[PDB]
Amino acid sequence: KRLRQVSSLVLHIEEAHKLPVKHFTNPYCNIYLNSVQVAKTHAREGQNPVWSEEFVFDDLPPDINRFEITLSNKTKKSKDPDILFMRCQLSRLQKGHATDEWFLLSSHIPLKGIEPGSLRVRARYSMEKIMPEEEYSEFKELILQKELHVVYALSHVCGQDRTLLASILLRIFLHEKLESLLLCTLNDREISMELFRATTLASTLMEQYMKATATQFVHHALKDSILKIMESKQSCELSPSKLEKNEDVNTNLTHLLNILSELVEKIFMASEILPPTLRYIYGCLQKSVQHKWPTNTTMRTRVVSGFVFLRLICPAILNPRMFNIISDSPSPIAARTLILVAKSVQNLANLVEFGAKEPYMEGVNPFIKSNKHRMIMFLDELGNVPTEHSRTDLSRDLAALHEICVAHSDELRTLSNERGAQQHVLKKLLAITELLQQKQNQYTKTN
């Protein structure tokens, strides 16, 4: 077919400085593409507000030549007034480079000697050139190769592009139903050179994959339990320094044990909702750990609970707002009980009982001790699994990956000149990358 031309504008509204006090008490921003409003920020405090809000405008129509920002005042005395504004032509934005500048503000109204102030905006105006998908065929075949040599090299060359490369690679392997090959091989290599407590490519791939595949396991296991804790008024406090007097610490500990027992049972039963691919990846984690440490017979449960509980379940109990569990913030009593439940679930997932560092928590130890074997059995059965699939814009993501190859070509060249089994494929990757660039030039030359 023909070349795809995709325009995008990312805007970061950071803060404003010395807004006129005579007109601003709760300033907020209106964002326009040309003169058409497309978004707005929240209302912030005072004359020097800080927003730090990001806006992504993908697939810009070809007639967008600028973005404008208008600063209004959120008030109830009248309709919100349009006070100040700036404008920025897209022609001043270097394509692909993220700019960071303060803009002197203009006015919709006479200011009569009052200084307008400034507005700090970060802006990235990008242009993607995407060939038809068939042109990336050989490129795609080299990436989906079974030993992932190109994947290894791309992780080594991307220092700060950890999250972007992971996002693009994850969507590509998901599109090709090969997310198991990607995640299992990288997790196995990660265990082979040691765990997982470092922010590696394997950890952020598992984090992105689990945020996309385990959302309804978390809901089915935690929503009902946390809802009951949200409307509750019975305390679970055990620290004698935080106990308002006339409180029986034994009723509080009894209530905590009833909460933990019902929630732990709910987690064990909601396990059936986990998708089989994620469970298969958990079993591969267990096999890789068993290969490396056949003597650490406890490690096979440690490696799984670190993802299921330490990274997924326990932070969802602590911060249930960021997981679409509950929109309303917890009560101070509900927050305290949630923290106590999370600490207990964490220690149970680690197969350890509270110690002399938390002497007030020893009342949960009998519950933890009697459930440790249930937790071991729960995790071993988790990985006990030996079109409706999630797709993406394949050509777009392949084009984005090729751009990363082009920008890191010389460091990938250093990589191809090292001894190992990855040598030939990295040489092919370089040849394919230059060929794709030559052909992108041909599409651009013929309009």
DSSP for 251-292? HHHHHHHHHHHHHHHHHHHHGGGS-HHHHHHHHHHHHHHHHH
Cβ neighbours of residue 350 under 8 Å, at least 6 residues apart? Answer: 302, 305, 310
What amino acid is encoded at 185 in this protein?
Answer: T
Which overall architecture, per CATH, does domain 133-196+389-445 show?
Orthogonal Bundle (1.10)
What is the side-by-side order of every strand in the sheet holding 118-130? 50-58, 4-17, 118-130, 99-104
CB-CB contact of 136 with 145 (8 Å): no
d(CA 62, CA 145): 38
| Element holding 119 (H helix, E strand) | strand 118-130
Overall size of the chain counted in residues: 447
Which DSSP state fits 432? H
So what's the architecture of 4-130 in CATH?
A: Sandwich (2.60)
What DSSP element (H or E) covers 226? helix 215-230
CA angle 345, 351, 354 (to 5 degrees): 70
Nearest to 343 by CA among 361, 367, 363, 370: 361
Resolution, rounded to a tenth of an Å?
Answer: 2.5
DSSP state of 322: G
**Contact criterion met (CB below 8 Å) for 284 and 184:** yes
State the burial class of residue 178 (Cβ atoms within 10 Å of its Cβ: 0-12, 13-18, 19+). Answer: middle
**Please, which residues have CB within 8 angstroms of residue 370's CB and are 6 or more apart in sequence?**
none
Distance CA 92, CA 310 (A): 46
Tell me whether residue 117 is exposed, middle or buried, using C-beta atoms within 10 angstroms of its C-beta: 0 to 12, 13 to 18, 19 or more. buried
SS3 content of the chain, % helix, strand, coil (to 5): 50, 15, 30
Do the domains at 4-130 and 214-382 have one common CATH topology?
Answer: no
How many other C-beta atoms are found inside a 10 Å radius of the C-beta of residue 8? 14
User: Structurally, what CATH architecture does the domain formed by 214-382 represent?
Assistant: Orthogonal Bundle (1.10)
Give the DSSP H/E element, type plus range, for residue 347: helix 332-349
Question: Strand 27-33 and strand 82-89: pairing?
Answer: unpaired
Q: Where are the domains of the chain?
A: 4-130, 133-196+389-445, 214-382
- Cα–Cα distance for residue pair 444/294, rounded to 1 Å: 57
DSSP element (H, E) containing 7: strand 4-17
